[PDB]
Amino acid sequence: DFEEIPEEYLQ
Amino acid sequence: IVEGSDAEIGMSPWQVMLFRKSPQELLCGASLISDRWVLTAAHCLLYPPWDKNFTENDLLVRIGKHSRTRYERNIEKISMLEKIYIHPRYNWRENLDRDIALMKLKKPVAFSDYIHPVCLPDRETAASLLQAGYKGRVTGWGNLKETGQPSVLQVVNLPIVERPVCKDSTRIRITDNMFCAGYKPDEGKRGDACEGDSGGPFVMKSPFNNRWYQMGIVSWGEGCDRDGKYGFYTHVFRLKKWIQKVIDQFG
Amino acid sequence: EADCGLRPLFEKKSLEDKTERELLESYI
Ligand SMILES: CC[C@@H](C(=O)NCc1ccc(C(=N)N)cc1)N(C)C(=O)[C@@H](Cc1ccccc1)NS(=O)(=O)Cc1ccccc1
Ligand SMILES: *[C@@H]1O[C@H](CO)[C@@H](O)[C@H](O)[C@H]1NC(C)=O
Ligand code: NA
Ligand code: NA
């Protein structure tokens, strides 16, 4: 339901 | 937020979203109190009856948001957590007494039109404003009804309620570290926080210096927007010595 | 912070939001 957030914040 | 309305852009620039990494979902609200510190409800991080016990790496903080689900490119900022601090006498066993936690960010967040800290009350502002009938403002991306979900941040203004009325509305043991707010059945008007709004701020605008102060944290309630029930809020000023102790020691 | 609780898009440009007057009116 949420838009994917930039990969840089999941590292 | 039940029976509230859409926030205006930049209306609540201290509003923070606590976001679960996996699965990607809203956990709670929170508030920005400096460029590196975020305030929330302890039960957003730790609540054993629901098997909740998050660590720093489980979570992200999203600041400057309006839309609930959108990634708001060039507007919101996403921060990682350095450390969680839960009040040492947080009572998750009984009644959520001292439902308060701090989160230190790994890096300072840049302030903008959409991102700005709220004030914490000192003794005099608390004494002046925490009075029955005086209204505060609650904001969040929580559920619109007790039993869907908002497109954007919701807002509702609610009056503080006399402590005997709060006490008589519930079987739960109320403490001096809590206050309650909401309309009475006879007052006609409605509104409440709900699931997902927890940890978010109850704020008041001082008529003395025209600054917004966070007086409360969304903590608990029996259902949402039920007649004769009220929302309960962590009393921020009562716990400010703990807040200052943590920031002085670790900030 | 010295600048806490003053919103860029409201207090900082002397604009009021649509319901803050409701709060003020309650502060009797
Ligand atoms: C963290 C547990 C807490 C909770 O759900 N708090 C979040 C919350 C925040 C605000 C409000 C509101 N203002 N109406 C309601 C719930 N909780 C179990 C409740 O509030 C309990 C009462 C309680 C208080 C303190 C200790 C134990 C039990 N009430 S409850 O009705 O179970 C919460 C609820 C509300 C709607 C949908 C599902 C659940
Ligand atoms: C919650 O998690 C930490 C570490 O994962 C653990 O030490 C603690 O005992 C758990 N329960 C609490 C704080 O009630
Ligand atoms: Na009672
Ligand atoms: Na109610």
Q: Is B235 a catalytic residue?
A: no
Pair (B107, B34) in one structural domain: yes
The β-bridge partners of B192 are B2
Residue C18 structural domain = 1-28
User: What is the domain count for chain B?
Assistant: 2
Question: Separation of B105 CA from ligand 1 center, angstroms?
Answer: 28
B53 Cα nearest atom in ligand 2? 1
Residue B20 structural domain = 13-117+238-250
Catalytic, out of B31, B198, B225, B235: B198
Pair (B124, B106) in one structural domain: no
Pair (B222, B128) in one structural domain: yes
How near does any CA of chain B get to the CA of A10, in Å? 7
Pair (B144, B77) in one structural domain: no
| Residues after which a C–N gap over 2.5 Å breaks chain B | 147
Cβ of B48 below 6 Å from ligand 2: yes
How many C-beta atoms surround the C-beta of residue B5 within 10 A?
14
Pair (B38, B105) in one structural domain: yes
Pair (B5, B74) in one structural domain: no
Exposed e or buried b per residue across B102-116, where buried means at least 16 C-beta atoms within 10 angstroms of its C-beta: bbbbeeebebbebbb
Pair (B64, B171) in one structural domain: no
Cβ of B195 below 6 Å from ligand 1: yes
User: In whole angstroms, what is the distance from residue B57 CA to residue B62 CA?
Assistant: 14
DSSP chain B: -BS-EEPPTTS-TTEEEEEETTTTEEEEEEEE-SSSEEEE-GGGTEEGGGTEE--GGGEEEEES--BSSS--TTT-EEEEEEEEEE-TT-BTTTT-BT--EEEEESSPPPPBTTB-PPBPP-HHHHHHH--TT-EEEEEESS-SS-----SB-EEEEEEB--HHHHHHT-SS---TTEEEE---GGG----B--TT-TT-EEEEE-TTT--EEEEEEEEE-SSSS-TT--EEEEETGGGHHHHHHHHHHH-
Q: What is the CATH number of the domain that holds B153?
A: 2.40.10.10
Q: How was this structure determined?
A: X-ray
Pair (B125, B206) in one structural domain: yes
Which residues of chain B neighbour A6 with C-beta distances below 8 Å?
Answer: 71, 78
Residue whose CA is closest, atom 9 of ligand 2?
B53
Give the strand pairing for B154-159 and B212-220: unpaired
Pair (B2, B30) in one structural domain: no
Exposed e or buried b per residue across B197-234, where buried means at least 16 C-beta atoms within 10 angstroms of its C-beta: bbbbbbbbbbeeeebbbbbbbbbbbeebbeeebbbbbb
Of B21, B69, B78, nearest to A1 by CB-CB distance is: B69
Q: Is B99 a catalytic residue?
A: yes
Does residue C13 belong to the interface with chain B, where contact is any CB pair within 8 Å? Answer: no
Pair (B176, B242) in one structural domain: no
Cβ of B160 below 6 Å from ligand 1: no
Which residues of chain A neighbour B21 with C-beta distances below 8 Å?
Answer: 10
Question: Separation of B83 CA from ligand 2 center, angstroms?
Answer: 14
Question: Separation of B222 CA from ligand 4 center, angstroms?
Answer: 9
User: In whole angstroms, what is the distance from residue B161 CA to residue B133 CA?
Assistant: 6
Pair (B130, B203) in one structural domain: yes
What are the structure tokens assigned to B96, written together?
A: 């959520």
What are the structure tokens assigned to B81, written together?
A: 């957590």
Helix count and strand count (H, E) for chain A:
0, 0
User: In whole angstroms, what is the distance from residue B16 CA to residue B67 CA?
Assistant: 12
Pair (B54, B68) in one structural domain: yes
User: What is the domain count for chain C?
Assistant: 1
Residue whose CA is closest, atom 5 of ligand 1?
B220
Resolution value in angstroms: 1.6
Helix count and strand count (H, E) for chain C:
1, 0
Q: What is the CATH number of the domain that holds C13?
A: 4.10.140.10
Nearest Cα residue to B250 out of B108, B109, B83: B83
Which chains border C (3 or more CB–CB pairs < 8 Å)? B
Of B69, B78, B80, nearest to A2 by CB-CB distance is: B69
User: In whole angstroms, what is the distance from residue B150 CA to residue B9 CA?
Assistant: 15
Nearest Cα residue to B218 out of B6, B67, B18: B18
Contact B115, B32 (CB under 8 A): yes
